[PDB]
């Protein structure tokens, strides 16, 4: 009773915080025309992904945990899973796109204005969501992701129970498409950006003989990794070895991954312009 009440309170606070932060950043971008910028379109895409997260898959999963069973229909189990995968992969790929945009802005400043335009920004944002949809809705709404052993068939036949059972192929493919490839891209581009920042710091020191880069990249990489790496590692493991990972650990790591959507406004919208916009909004 008290233990369940605590989980309910924590999940309610989490969903409230996620929704509030994401609607705040979205309405700040929408209301003020100064915030509208090529990178802010990617920020808006990420905020929309986190908002649909907090609206659809956080409270439904909270109900699925607090109450033992899935009251809603089996089709709605499939739809909730599809929306969850869509939101996760869209958020991670949008983070990768933002990292790529920063890398292009810093590495090739002269051509950066040509490479990234409003029309190209819209094309990239739609392409990200198209990839996310082809990753999530296409294999899950249809019966591709369903496993073959007896447990998966029993779970999928019963309408009251809604859990996650997945083929090796789809588990590996979803993990690679969602996290590991964006992880590689983001790590590479941020290593290049850190090298450029260190080079400029050395140039300034050499010119004016009379730290900051480490903290920013540190938090940007650390939050995303500490939120999502354990879940995707156990996503690989639980199908590489069936008995390795228990269900409760898997769900807990999945929710720690969900928590990342709340932290995105704090990391990617701390600029003084955003601070002034938030002050004006409230």
């Amino acid at each position: 009773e008290v233990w369940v009440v605590g989980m309910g309170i924590v999940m309610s606070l989490i969903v409230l915080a996620i929704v509030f932060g994401n609607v705040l950043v979205i309405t700040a971008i929408a209301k003020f025309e100064r915030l509208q910028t090529v990178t802010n379109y990617f920020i808006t895409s990420l905020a929309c992904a986190d908002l649909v997260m907090g609206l659809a898959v956080v409270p439904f999963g909270a109900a699925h945990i607090l109450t033992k069973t899935w009251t809603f229909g089996n089709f709605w189990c499939e739809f909730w899973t599809s929306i969850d995968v869509l939101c996760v992969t869209a958020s991670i790929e949008t983070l990768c796109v933002i990292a790529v945009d920063r890398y292009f802005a810093i590495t090739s400043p002269f051509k950066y204005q040509s490479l990234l335009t409003k029309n190209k920004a819209r094309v990239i944002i739609l392409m990200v969501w198209i990839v996310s949809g082809l990753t999530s809705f296409l294999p899950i709404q249809m019966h591709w992701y369903r496993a073959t052993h007896q447990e998966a068939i029993n779970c999928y036949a019963e309408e009251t129970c809604c859990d996650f059972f997945t083929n090796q192929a789809y588990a590996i493919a979803s993990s690679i498409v969602s996290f590991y490839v964006p992880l590689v891209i983001m790590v590479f581009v941020y290593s290049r950006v850190f090298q450029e920042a260190k080079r400029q710091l050395q140039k300034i020191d050499k010119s004016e003989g009379r730290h900051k880069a480490l903290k920013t990249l540190g938090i940007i990489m650390g939050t995303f990794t500490l939120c999502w790496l354990p879940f995707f590692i156990v996503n690989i493991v639980h199908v590489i070895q069936d008995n390795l990972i228990r269900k409760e650990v898997y769900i807990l790591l999945n929710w720690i991954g969900y928590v990342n959507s709340g932290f995105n406004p704090l990391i990617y919208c701390r600029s003084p312009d955003f601070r002034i916009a938030f002050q004006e909004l409230l």
Binding site: R102, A105, I106, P109, F110, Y112, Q113, S114, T117, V193, F194, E196, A197, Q200, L201, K203, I204, K206, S207, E208, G209, R210, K212, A213, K215, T216, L217, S271
Partner: protein, 230 residues
């Protein structure tokens, strides 16, 4: 009456398409302001490259240098127009430490301080060219005129350990001029804009490459400081 509205909408669409093309053209190029004294030798630099504009490109990047001259006024208010420029190129003669037309160097330092300490030019970086190094070397090497009389602070100055030299005395003088400019550069700024002191002679033809590199550094540092990376 709806026909007039439709025709006006078509004209608006055509004008908007032309404006988009002009935006693609305009956002690509970079605009520079050339700002120096008349005797500084800016003519030499602009040649190697009421208002004079020069279109010079390098590495497929279009630079637009707007040298303003003939509007010789102590009060410069057209300077507020050059708030969106990539950089302000400053040309100063470093061989004029003893010319009163107080000294030319002191007038140039006052101009540099006024430009640096401008509310509108807070974010604009200044590329500094210390022209006429050969004449300065000839003047200091002769020893007829000593900087100590015109600049008392030249005394008690030793050559910086981290220096890239040539005669020791002329190098002392050159780095004194650089430090005199860089003190004004660093005292007021908060990291938004920097100064890039370059030593140029009338013979040097690589100033285009130097301006290209300095503009690249300026935009790179601007992007790095827009984020918390620097």
């Amino acid at each position: 009456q709806r026909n007039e509205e439709k025709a006006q909408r078509e004209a608006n669409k055509k004008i908007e398409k032309q404006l988009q093309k002009d935006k693609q053209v305009y956002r690509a190029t970079h605009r520079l302001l050339l700002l120096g004294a008349g005797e500084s030798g800016k003519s030499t630099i602009v040649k190697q490259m009421g208002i004079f504009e020069t279109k010079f490109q390098v590495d497929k990047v279009n630079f637009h240098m707007f040298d303003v001259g003939g509007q010789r006024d102590e009060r410069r208010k057209w300077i507020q127009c050059f708030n969106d420029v990539t950089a302000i190129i400053f040309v100063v003669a470093s061989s004029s430490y003893n010319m009163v037309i107080t000294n030319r160097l002191q007038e140039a330092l006052n101009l540099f301080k006024s430009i640096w300490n401008n509310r509108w030019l807070r974010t604009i970086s200044v590329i500094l060219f210390l022209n006429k190094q050969d004449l300065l070397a000839e003047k200091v090497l002769a020893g007829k005129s000593k900087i100590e009389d015109y600049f008392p602070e030249f005394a008690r100055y030793t050559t910086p350990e981290d220096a890239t030299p040539e005669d020791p005395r002329v190098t002392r003088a050159k780095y004194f001029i650089r430090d005199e400019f860089l003190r004004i550069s660093t005292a007021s700024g908060d990291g938004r804009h920097y100064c890039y002191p370059h030593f140029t002679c009338a013979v040097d033809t690589e100033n285009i490459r130097r301006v290209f590199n300095d503009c690249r550094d300026i935009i790179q540092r601007m992007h790095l400081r827009q984020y918390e990376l620097l």
